[PDB]
Amino acid sequence: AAAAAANLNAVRETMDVLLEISRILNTGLDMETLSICVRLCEQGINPEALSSVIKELRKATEALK
Amino acid sequence: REIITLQLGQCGNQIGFEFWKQLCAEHGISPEGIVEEFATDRKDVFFYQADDEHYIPRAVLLDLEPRVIHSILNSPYAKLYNPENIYLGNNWASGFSQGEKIHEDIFDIIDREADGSDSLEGFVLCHSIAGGTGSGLGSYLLERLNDRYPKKLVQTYSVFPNQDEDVVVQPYNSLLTLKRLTQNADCVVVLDNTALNRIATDRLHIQNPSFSQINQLVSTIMSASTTTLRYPGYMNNDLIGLIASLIPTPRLHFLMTGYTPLTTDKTTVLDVMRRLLQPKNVMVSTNHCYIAILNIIQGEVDPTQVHKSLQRIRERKLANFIPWGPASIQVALSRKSPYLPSAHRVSGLMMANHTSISSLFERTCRQYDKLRKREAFLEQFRKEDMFKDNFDEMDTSREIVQQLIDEYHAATRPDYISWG
Amino acid sequence: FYCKHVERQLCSVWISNKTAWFAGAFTLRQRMLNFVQNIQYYMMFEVMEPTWHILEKNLKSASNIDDVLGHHTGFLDTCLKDCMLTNPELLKVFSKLMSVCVMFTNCMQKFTQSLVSGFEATINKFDKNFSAHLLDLLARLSIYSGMASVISRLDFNGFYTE
Amino acid sequence: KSPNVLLQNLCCRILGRSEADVAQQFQYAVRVIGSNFAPTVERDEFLVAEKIKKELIRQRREADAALFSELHRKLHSQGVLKNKWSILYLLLSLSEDPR
């Protein structure tokens, strides 16, 4: 509709403001990855579990290089 | 003959509400429609002699996101007109598409009232240009009315969208609506919102309730323009006669509004004629020249006064002429209405075809051209994209309004065997 | 009544001719309707209403019937004689112009095709016939013995002055 | 979707590779995320905001610590995120010290 795309505006906003929070804490996640990271959190998930996976995948892109 | 008045949008239902209240107070009727004892007249122009001894006006009630229309509902003037035909925004594309999907039963509503009256003269549309609610649906209904009935007249009382304004799609909406106005209407009466705003902030010191006071102005003008139809004269007891002289050709059908008192809250015809001819008693504010003017006066008029006043108007030359022909200000006399307030006993109004409205058109065209060149002010409205993914209607409307400006400038010339 | 009949015809042409060919009949129709409407404005608001309002002052201040009889006869005789009715040669150009009006509106109502040049040629033939007689009217009335009122009503710009 | 294949999307996003090119890393993702779906520790967004400000003072990005005061407000202003706490703890956990 029209308001049903205004909610799509309000999600792209969430995604951008969490990227500003992402750069000031200096994490490696970019915009495209952060859009996966918000989707996972809607079902509910441990950040303590996700951080070790991300801290391994960033340690396995130059070791699988 | 008989006029069926159409009102739509919140602004259009507002001006129709105030106009119906004005004609209720003017003629001898109650807000229920109860006959008075003082009422050469006619009560069959906007009014049907309806079937509970209330002169119920033939009005099409259309609502789109109703807020003020709810206030029209719980009102003593809802006992004057309600033939029970109320049927359900901020964009031209949304109102156009919403009017498109339901054209059938609202056309049946139009057909019901068309069968309602014995005769018909025209369709007067209470319309607001780029008003959001009126916009789009009004242009689509204009296409439906002019296509479905080619034998009648279409009138559109219109405002010019400049209210010292946020909406940036407003030039696109006004441009598309103006394309419909040029192509799908026989005559258009245009007013400026900024002009009436200046006049209102002049005569009083109001800043906030400007809308309602502007409504008073347009309702008084609409009553004044159809006084010669509602009260039997000798000419312009039909719409087409008043429409005929001002409009020389099907492209120049846009009329300026004048009315010589700006006051109702001693006088002669001679003074109000010279007071009318200035462009600051005009309620619409290079060589700029009128095509044709027509003035209608109502009051205690000595018949020699219009004669020598027109003498003075000639040898003073205080009116802008037409090169290619004679088409000049015409003196019309009408009856003073019963139960109108006794200020400005000799009072006149004018309707005129002027080339100066081309300036306002090209200003709005320049605003559209700016926002269109920048390409950041379509806002990606979803109805605007789905209605036209290529947006070629904006180009077609720009071409039509450019041809309109060229024909205006060509009519300005002493040769109008050169066209545009 | 004849002058009202032609007004109905001339308005009908403009409303039907707008379809949602030529501009040669646009200016011809603008010179016909804005002729006949102004004969009404003159013929009423100078002859009829002034003298009728004075005749209401004759029906308050006159003490006998052989005044009122003469006043009434004078109003009727002037409301004929100051117009084209009992004019001695009638100003016959008025009947001729009205004939060109009725022929023009008859042809212009057949604007529907199913030759555009044949319509254009007969409209221009009418245009010659009309414009000549309009100038002949202005001349013939200007020589006849009140003139400037109806002349300034008919043209104000002076696009034609003869 | 399902969260198991959505985690495979995350494994395509961090790395620069296709999913038939590597299956080891997605196996590390499913082994760590698995048999746990619900936080068993303290839940409050307010405390993790007071842990993000405390961390930005420690890194002397104290003007960015007044930026986070606006960004958390913007996060509340949209209001379409179900758990605000999980992503704040996640973004806090991956924090680097460039000083």
Numbering used by the authors:
A (entry chain o): 11 to 75
B (entry chain O): 3 to 41, 45 to 93, 101 to 177, 180 to 279, 287 to 306, 313 to 447
C (entry chain A): 646 to 665, 675 to 768, 814 to 844, 851 to 867
D (entry chain n): 7 to 105
Quote the original article.
The gamma-tubulin ring complex (γ-TuRC) is the principal microtubule nucleation template in vertebrates. Microtubules are formed de novo in a process termed nucleation, which is spatially and temporally highly controlled by γ-tubulin complexes, composed of γ-tubulin1 and associated γ-tubulin-complex proteins (GCP). In most eukaryotes, microtubules are templated from a preassembled γ-tubulin ring complex (γ-TuRC) that determines the position and direction of microtubule growth. Here, we used cryo-EM to identify and characterize γ-TuRC assembly intermediates after recombinant expression of the complex, which allowed us to delineate a comprehensive stepwise assembly pathway from a stable 6-spoked core to the mature 14-spoked γ-TuRC, identifying successive stabilization and conformational locking of γ-TuSC units as central principles in the assembly process.
To study the impact of inhibited actin integration on the structure of γ-TuRC, we replaced full-length GCP6 in the recombinant expression system by an N-terminally truncated form of GCP6 (ΔN56-GCP6), reconstituted γ-TuRCΔN56-GCP6 and subjected the complex to cryo-EM analysis. During computational sorting of cryo-EM particles, we identified similar γ-TuRC assembly intermediates as for wild-type γ-TuRC, but unexpectedly also fully assembled 14-spoke γ-TuRCΔN56-GCP6 complexes. We obtained a cryo-EM reconstruction of fully assembled γ-TuRCΔN56-GCP6 at 7.1 Å global resolution, which was highly similar to the wild-type complex. However, as expected, actin was not incorporated into the γ-TuRCΔN56-GCP6, as indicated by the absence of cryo-EM density for this component. Surprisingly, the remaining segments of the lumenal bridge were still well-structured, allowing for detailed dissection of the MZT1-containing modules in the lumenal bridge. While the MZT1-GCP3(8) module forming the basis of the lumenal bridge was structurally identical to the wild-type complex, no cryo-EM density could be observed for the first two N-terminal GCP6 α-helices, as expected. Notably, all three α-helices of the GCP6-associated MZT1 copy were well-resolved, indicating that the first two N-terminal GCP6 α-helices are dispensable for stable folding of the MZT1-GCP6 module. We therefore compared the overall geometry of wild-type and actin binding-deficient γ-TuRC and observed that the arrangement and conformation of spokes 3–14 is very similar in both complexes. In contrast, the positioning of the γ-TuSC(1,2) GRIP2 domains is altered in the actin binding-deficient γ-TuRC and the two respective γ-tubulin subunits are displaced away from the helical axis, resulting in a γ-tubulin positioning that is less compatible with the almost ideal helical arrangement of αβ-tubulin units in the microtubule lattice.
